[PDB]
Design a protein around this ligand. Sequence first.
Ligand SMILES: N[C@@H](CCC(=O)N[C@@H](CS)C(=O)NCC(=O)O)C(=O)O
Ligand SMILES: N[C@@H](CCC(=O)N[C@@H](CS)C(=O)NCC(=O)O)C(=O)O
Lengths: 207, 207
Amino acid sequence: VDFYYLPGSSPCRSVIMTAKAVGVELNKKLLNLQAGEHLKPEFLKINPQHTIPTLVDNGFALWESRAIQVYLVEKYGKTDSLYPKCPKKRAVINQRLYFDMGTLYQSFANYYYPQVFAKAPADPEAFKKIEAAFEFLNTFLEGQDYAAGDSLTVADIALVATVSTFEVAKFEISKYANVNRWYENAKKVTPGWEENWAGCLEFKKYF
Amino acid sequence: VDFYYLPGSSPCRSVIMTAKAVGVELNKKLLNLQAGEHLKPEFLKINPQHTIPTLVDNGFALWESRAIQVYLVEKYGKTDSLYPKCPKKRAVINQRLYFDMGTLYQSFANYYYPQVFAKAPADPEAFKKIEAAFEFLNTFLEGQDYAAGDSLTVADIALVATVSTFEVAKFEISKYANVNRWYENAKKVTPGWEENWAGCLEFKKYF
Ligand SMILES: N[C@@H](CCC(=O)N[C@@H](CS)C(=O)NCC(=O)O)C(=O)O
Ligand SMILES: N[C@@H](CCC(=O)N[C@@H](CS)C(=O)NCC(=O)O)C(=O)O
């Protein structure tokens, strides 16, 4: 199973943690975006969208981190606890995965990427979207130890990658008590946490 | 099955078409965002994120359109053709669903929403992101009649909602030959197309 990635990338880290949780060995292939390695014909043949993470598993090329997470659980999970069979349980997880992409990580990208990638001054209105997203996550976690069910799921793992990126970016997570509680627990229970944190510190080099 | 929605909303329309495709009757409940009906305590108790679409199915409150689509197929589908059992088939569909959210519809929102909702002048750099997203979709559709498998899936239905919103916004879809071919076919085969198009024309009132 080939895995095209960089350690600093949040969506890559979500896959790293998920693979560790299911116990599937990845052939980790660094793909140097700053050198344009993802833009060369050899990579475009695998993933025409030229994004990381990309998985190539026995002929199957797959991208979108959250799709990769679910596929790894379905194929390699000795049990389905990270992504249970029940459609209702799956639906809550799926909702959280879309929240992670379209609300929470999107707010990260919209606020920090113009600063670190375009050298633009911080946009205080974009900052308010981060606050709104954390407020929602805080509500989702009211009375809950995990984000999308009774136990750790791929939704938690995706959210850990995102929230740890916020942590290294110096966002004050402590303001959101349920998020902080969930997050500090997640560090202790989530497979691959240490590797995720190493990657967050690599990402930090952009600040 | 309660369905909180507005006809003009693209993510709502994806659910409308999916429900028609699986043959599940929805109790359609208009939720007037301009009146703040989604912000009142009675709705926040159902969906604290105060978004449409929201489904309430026998006690289960669910939001995120693409999560709702999959849940409706899993629960009500007499067959699984719209979201097959095979994890590999599911993974491609899931990838496309994330593409629809995070690449294609995101490019719609980033370009048109500031214009129609904030009265800002058009941003030509944001326009280039739409072009990039259509280019990718055009490549995905090379040699393919459907977006994510041999037959119509929930990925096609989500993409139809998005691309029809582009159509009513006067984006020139014809420039992307595979997209245009796929889209014109999708109109003829996708359950609920007419209702989707009515909603696109309602959305058009914002232009
Ligand atoms: N929605 C994606 C995002 C992937 C993504 O944007 N990756 C970035 C790096 S963090 C990338 O490959 N950028 C290079 C490019 O798009 O050309 C996922 O969850 O996998
Ligand atoms: N990612 C979502 C987006 C839902 C969404 O943003 N809906 C808009 C209307 S098109 C909304 O409810 N806005 C009101 C709000 O967020 O307060 C989904 O696919 O369902």
